[PDB]
Amino acid sequence: PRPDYVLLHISDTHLIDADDRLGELLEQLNQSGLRPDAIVFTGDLADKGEPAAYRKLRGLVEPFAAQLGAELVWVMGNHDDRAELRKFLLDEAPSMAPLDRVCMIDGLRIIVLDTSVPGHHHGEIRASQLGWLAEELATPAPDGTILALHHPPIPSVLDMAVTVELRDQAALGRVLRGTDVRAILAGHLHYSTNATFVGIPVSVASATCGCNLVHVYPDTVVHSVIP
Amino acid sequence: PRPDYVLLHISDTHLIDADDRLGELLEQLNQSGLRPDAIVFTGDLADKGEPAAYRKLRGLVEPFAAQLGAELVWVMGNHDDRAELRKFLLDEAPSMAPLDRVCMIDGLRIIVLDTSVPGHHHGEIRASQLGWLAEELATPAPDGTILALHHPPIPSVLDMAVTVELRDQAALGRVLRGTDVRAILAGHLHYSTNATFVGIPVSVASATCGCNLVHVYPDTVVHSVIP
Ligand SMILES: [Fe+3]
Numbered sequence: 266p267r268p269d270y271v272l273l274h275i276s277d278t279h280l281i282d283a284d285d286r287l288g289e290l291l292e293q294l295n296q297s298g299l300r301p302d303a304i305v306f307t308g309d310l311a312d313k314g315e316p317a318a319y320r321k322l323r324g325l326v327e328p329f330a331a332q333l334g335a336e337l338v339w340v341m342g343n344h345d346d347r348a349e350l351r352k353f354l355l356d357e358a359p360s361m362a363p364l365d366r367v368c369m370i371d372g373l374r375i376i377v378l379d380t381s382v383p384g385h386h387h388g389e390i391r392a393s394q395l396g397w398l399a400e401e402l403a404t405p406a407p408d409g410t411i412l413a414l415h416h417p418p419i420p421s422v423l424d425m426a427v428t429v430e431l432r433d434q435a436a437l438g439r440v441l442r443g444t445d446v447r448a449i450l451a452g453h454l455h456y457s458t459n460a461t462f463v464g465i466p467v468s469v470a471s472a473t474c475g476c477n478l479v480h481v482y483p484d485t486v487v488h489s490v491i492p
Numbered sequence: 493p494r495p496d497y498v499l500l501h502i503s504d505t506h507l508i509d510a511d512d513r514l515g516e517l518l519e520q521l522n523q524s525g526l527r528p529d530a531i532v533f534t535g536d537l538a539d540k541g542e543p544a545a546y547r548k549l550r551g552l553v554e555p556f557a558a559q560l561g562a563e564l565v566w567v568m569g570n571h572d573d574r575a576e577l578r579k580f581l582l583d584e585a586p587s588m589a590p591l592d593r594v595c596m597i598d599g600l601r602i603i604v605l606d607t608s609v610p611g612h613h614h615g616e617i618r619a620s621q622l623g624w625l626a627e628e629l630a631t632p633a634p635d636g637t638i639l640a641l642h643h644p645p646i647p648s649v650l651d652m653a654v655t656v657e658l659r660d661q662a663a664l665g666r667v668l669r670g671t672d673v674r675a676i677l678a679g680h681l682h683y684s685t686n687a688t689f690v691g692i693p694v695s696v697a698s699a700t701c702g703c704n705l706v707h708v709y710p711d712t713v714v715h716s717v718i719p
Pocket residue numbers: 277279308309342344453455
């Protein structure tokens with residue numbers, strides 16, 4: 266069966282040997298002959314949100330994505346810095362506003378949401394963002410929506426995770442319920458995990474410092490873990 | 493958060509170094525301090541369905557499960573033999589009837605289904621089994637149902653997989669739709685994969701020759717991949 270879309274889901278690169286780890290992955294993905302429609306990086310791109318790390322990340326990943334004709338989708342994590350990411354990864358004016366955006370890949374909507382809280386490790390979504398999200402989802406996409414964020418809306422199975430988990434998941438749940446969100450892509454946990462959130466499948470990719478393949482069929486979304 | 497139930501999801505042990513691989517896993521799980529309510533093995537237990545392999549499997553796994561007070565849940569795979577498994581793993585009279593069974597873990601229903609076809613590698617579910625399954629699911633379990641089987645009802649992302657995939661998934665889908673089946677546990681693929689089937693989350697554990705942790709919360713089921 267041919268999927269409608271193929272995505273690559275990578276997370277938690279933590280660049281500041283993370284350079285070798287990511288380099289080795291990209292080289293391995295290049296040799297596979299995989300041709301993704303988009304490559305989605307679900308946060309913690311730079312370990313300390315360093316300008317130099319973003320420059321290195323961009324230098325490694327942009328030629329890889331260009332070779333494949335794949336859209337690059339960057340997401341904020343708790344380790345990242347909004348202003349330095351905008352500047353050195355995106356070529357956008359520095360700002361501390363949430364990195365929220367919408368990207369249509371043919372008929373497939375990818376929504377990037379920013380769960381990060383500046384100077385903190387836990388996750389939160391502000392009122393402005395929920396409203397923005399609700400308004401966007403009021404119009405259905407032809408092939409539905411993939412929501413990409415950092416902190417997963419799933420129960421913490423480790424005590425260590427609870428202190429840095431996504432807070433106020435109920436409010437997000439109220440926005441997402443009944444929408445065309447078909448899957449939520451996340452990171453943060455540094456091990457491969459899946460669950461549902463208000464009936465929506467959530468898939469967490471492990472850290473790079475493997476990744477996931479995402480096959481979007483007409484009726485289901487398949488997430489495969491690539492070590 | 494405390495889950496309602498903890499399950500261990502292991503698959504594709506292929507015993508006939510698979511002995512060392514499984515031994516090393518069980519020892520590792522024992523050191524973790526994990527106390528599962530059940531341990532579910534989703535098929536391909538013996539590589540050639542050998543009596544000796546089932547004896548070895550039983551010898552390795554029964555003391556492990558006994559130490560933890562965990563229920564053992566065995567599932568048929570394409571590599572297994574129904575008669576030899578019944579005899580040497582279960583202490584049951586030899587039979588080639590499908591290995592279908594129901595196990596209540598407090599309020600949680602685990603249904604074991606047999607997708608294997610004797611002498612063949614692909615998956616099928618017979619009419620007798622669908623009827624049996626439909627009748628069982630007509631009564632809801634207090635905490636819903638986990639369906640455990642070998643061949644996953646998810647699209648084959650590899651060409652090699654298509655020839656040995658589960659056939660006639662539509663019929664199974666018709667039975668499961670609207671039931672209290674909250675999750676489907678599967679194997680067969682030999683890599684970690686998740687998707688939905690008729691709105692129901694399906695989680696495939698990789699092979700042993702790691703495994704998954706399953707945390708059942710009141711409102712969601714979390715699957716975590718343990719390398
Ligand atoms: Fe991280």
